[PDB]
Amino acid sequence: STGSATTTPIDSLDDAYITPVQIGTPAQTLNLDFDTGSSDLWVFSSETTASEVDGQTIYTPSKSTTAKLLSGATWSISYGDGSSSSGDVYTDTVSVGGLTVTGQAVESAKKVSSSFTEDSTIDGLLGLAFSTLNTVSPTQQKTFFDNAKASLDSPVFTADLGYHAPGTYNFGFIDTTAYTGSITYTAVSTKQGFWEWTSTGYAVGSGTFKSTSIDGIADTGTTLLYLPATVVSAYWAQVSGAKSSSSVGGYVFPCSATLPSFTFGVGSARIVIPGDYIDFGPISTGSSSCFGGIQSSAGIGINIFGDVALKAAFVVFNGATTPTLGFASK
């Protein structure tokens, strides 16, 4: 079996992408953020504190004939940005673009941090990292992808994110019309529970490619590209007037400047991120200072290949026994 769903940017900056997901019987449609950097499927619900809900669509398990409380199970998650959520667990039927899983753990939020409350367009997250990161206690739960794996024609999912445009998430098949050339596959390490891989180097604009190993994770739930301070200083040194601002919390550049491209290595192949994808607009409305898409990973502890990098390629997440990541130009 296969699944295919459209993913849409939440705003004009591609801050996040939402995909419609059907939960329960009769179906309740929620717009979820597909996250390859986490492993929990959690939603805003009829149990969430009324003051912490601001325009989101909520899941109501009492209105679903297939919903069952997972007695005693609780979950608690904290993200890299400082945001958090916790609550109880239900099992229910979940479908993504025609692909149905029965008995999926659906984590019902009782408490959510202000970061989630502010985003009225996001009804929850659908975790696609390895099930070892799931926060359900005492019984750890499987992700939607892990539960669907047996039914799928191939144990894969693909991410095809658009630049200021909708894209696609496919499950169980590789669309050979969505990319040009061939797909380069690279080894994944599952030791930390992420889609962790090693990039073979980088280039700034039309400069020479520097061969160097950059270990990082493929994360659809992170907006920006976070790389080591050395690489990031070499990129921003090419932008006139660019500087790191402590007040802003990262590199900023004059909105009048043209940004060079950034190339990252995948084995012997090159993926080129156009300069426009690195522009995240004014820091405040009317400002002449613009926020950059390539930032330092020094304060994080891990290099992250987020949406800025992923939307420049057709990306294959191969969940076979020996997992691999595939990259192709598009």
Curated annotation (Swiss-Prot):
Catalysed reaction(s) here are: Hydrolysis of proteins with specificity similar to that of pepsin A, prefers hydrophobic residues at P1 and P1', but does not cleave 14-Ala-|-Leu-15 in the B chain of insulin or Z-Glu-Tyr. Clots milk
Which BP terms from GO are recorded? proteolysis
Q: Does the keyword Disulfide bond apply?
A: yes
Name any one GO molecular function: aspartic-type endopeptidase activity
The keyword S-adenosyl-L-methionine appears for this protein: no
User: Which keywords does this chain's UniProt record carry?
Assistant: Aspartyl protease, Disulfide bond, Hydrolase, Protease, Signal, Zymogen
EC class name: hydrolase
EC number(s) per UniProt?
3.4.23.22
Active site positions, chain numbering: D35, S199
Q: Which residues form the Peptidase A1 domain?
A: 17-328
Q: Which cysteines are joined by disulfide bonds?
A: C255-C290
Q: Which family does it belong to?
A: Belongs to the peptidase A1 family.
Mind telling me what this protein is named?
A: Endothiapepsin
Q: Which organism is it from?
A: Cryphonectria parasitica
